[PDB]
């Protein structure tokens, strides 16, 4: 399947994956990294590369990161730059992770998966508000 | 048998929870979902919310056990594949007694509670739930326990056999 | 300030808060809960209530949860039902948390904060894609 790597400031990436697996069961072909104060983008590039070495990246790689412009995002950006089937998507949330992991098994094309991740991530943000009676 | 076709029977006191209904809907190829519960049917507020969050392309219906037996007695859904959602195995034995045909029952999840015994990570059974499962098994009906189709399938009798003799 | 409670399946809520604090510094008036297999909505309602007892809820409470329809969401829904200035927003992500925590200090109205959280959460989901040269 298409490889997924999750990166956030701190230690949240591992937990977002754990949460997803609590919902979907253990996942294959997924990696994650942490970012600790004192580290820079170059440290992170190495961390991402070490994770990729263990993943099947033949169909592509989708980096799901916490926020646009942070170190995790900047480092991932440097890796995907002139690579086909490599993308970085900021704002990772559980709806995005769950929908993306579910679709991945039905072997979608890379563009299809990227589009689904952005759409489900955004549609997943919703307020309860008053309900009709 | 020449009437509606039960694509799958999932038991869950939460009905739709997480992507369990979304993933199970696509894998089970289900375009219709019917909820059988008198307590929920009496909650107009909950019915509205469940109907407004019904997955796209999928219709969610809310009916009572007595009304459900009649909907199945109508060939209007013949061949149609529908998923049955229950909150307790007691309501499943009732449909069978009405002449409903069930080949197997899948346990999705059951809120734990005091006085009950935990058989799985989130599945609890009381002397009443166990008694219903034994009757279904005595009828040759298969009972499988699993939270997601990607998780290993376990036999309800095996889990209750290592607890209740 | 307006109280914020974060709830997610598993143990991710504490880490999402830690990540936010790595970006913004330690936060006040924020609570979180975990959800372990075996627990039900009633257990979670108690957990949320115990957290609320320690928070200043005079201006309102915003529950930020992982996904629409999960137990964390269902339990939070039961608490906010007929309460003024109580809301539940699904799809929590770092952009939403950071923007929401930042605005909270400028003492916005409850409706203003709820609207900002949904908007920043959604706008935070964005793909890098090819860039102009």
UniProtKB/Swiss-Prot annotation, chain B:
Q: Which GO biological process entries does UniProt record here?
A: D-glucose import across plasma membrane; fructose import across plasma membrane; mannose transmembrane transport; N-acetylglucosamine transport; phosphoenolpyruvate-dependent sugar phosphotransferase system
Q: Which cellular component, as a GO term, is one annotated location?
A: cytoplasm
Modified residues annotated as Phosphohistidine in this record: 17
| Localization per Swiss-Prot or TrEMBL | Cytoplasm; Cell inner membrane
- Residues crossing the lipid bilayer are none
Q: What is known of its domains?
A: The PTS EIIA type-4 domain is phosphorylated by phospho-HPr on a histidyl residue. Then, it transfers the phosphoryl group to the PTS EIIB type-4 domain.
How does this chain assemble?
Homodimer.
- Function in brief: The phosphoenolpyruvate-dependent sugar phosphotransferase system (sugar PTS), a major carbohydrate active transport system, catalyzes the phosphorylation of incoming sugar substrates concomitantly with their translocation across the cell membrane. The enzyme II ManXYZ PTS system is involved in mannose transport.
From the Swiss-Prot or TrEMBL record, give the protein name: PTS system mannose-specific EIIAB component
Annotated source species: Escherichia coli (strain K12)
Gene name? Answer: manX
Which span of the parent protein is shown here?
159 to 323 of 323
């Amino acid at each position: 399947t298409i490889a997924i790597v999750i990166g956030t400031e701190g230690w949240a990436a591992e937990q977002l994956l754990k949460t997803a697996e609590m919902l979907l069961g253990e996942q294959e072909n997924v990696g994650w990294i942490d970012f600790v104060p004192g580290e820079n983008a170059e440290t992170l590039i190495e961390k991402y590369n070490a994770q990729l070495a263990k993943l099947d990246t033949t169909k592509g790689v989708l980096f799901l990161v916490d926020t646009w412009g942070g170190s995790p995002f900047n480092a991932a950006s440097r890796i995907v730059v002139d690579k086909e089937h490599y993308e970085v998507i900021a704002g990772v949330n559980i709806p995005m992770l769950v929908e993306t992991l579910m679709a991945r098994d039905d072997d979608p094309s890379f563009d299809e998966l990227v589009a689904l991740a952005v759409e489900t991530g955004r549609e997943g943000v919703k307020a309860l508000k008053a309900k009709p009676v | 048998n020449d009437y509606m076709v039960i694509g799958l029977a999932r038991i869950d006191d939460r009905l739709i929870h997480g992507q369990v209904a979304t993933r199970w809907t696509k894998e089970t190829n289900v375009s219709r979902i019917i909820v059988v519960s008198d307590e929920v049917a009496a909650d107009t507020v909950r019915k509205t919310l469940l109907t407004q969050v019904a997955p796209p392309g999928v219709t969610a219906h809310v009916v009572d056990v007595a009304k459900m037996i009649r909907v199945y007695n109508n060939p209007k859904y013949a061949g149609e594949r529908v998923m049955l959602l229950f909150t307790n195995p007691t309501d499943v034995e009732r449909l069978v007694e009405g002449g409903v045909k069930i080949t197997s029952v899948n346990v999705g999840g059951m809120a734990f509670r005091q006085g009950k015994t935990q058989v799985n990570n989130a599945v609890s059974v009381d002397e009443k739930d166990i008694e219903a499962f034994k009757k279904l098994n005595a009828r040759g009906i298969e009972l499988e326990v699993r939270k997601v189709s990607t998780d290993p399938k376990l036999k309800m009798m095996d889990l209750i056999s290592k607890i209740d003799k």
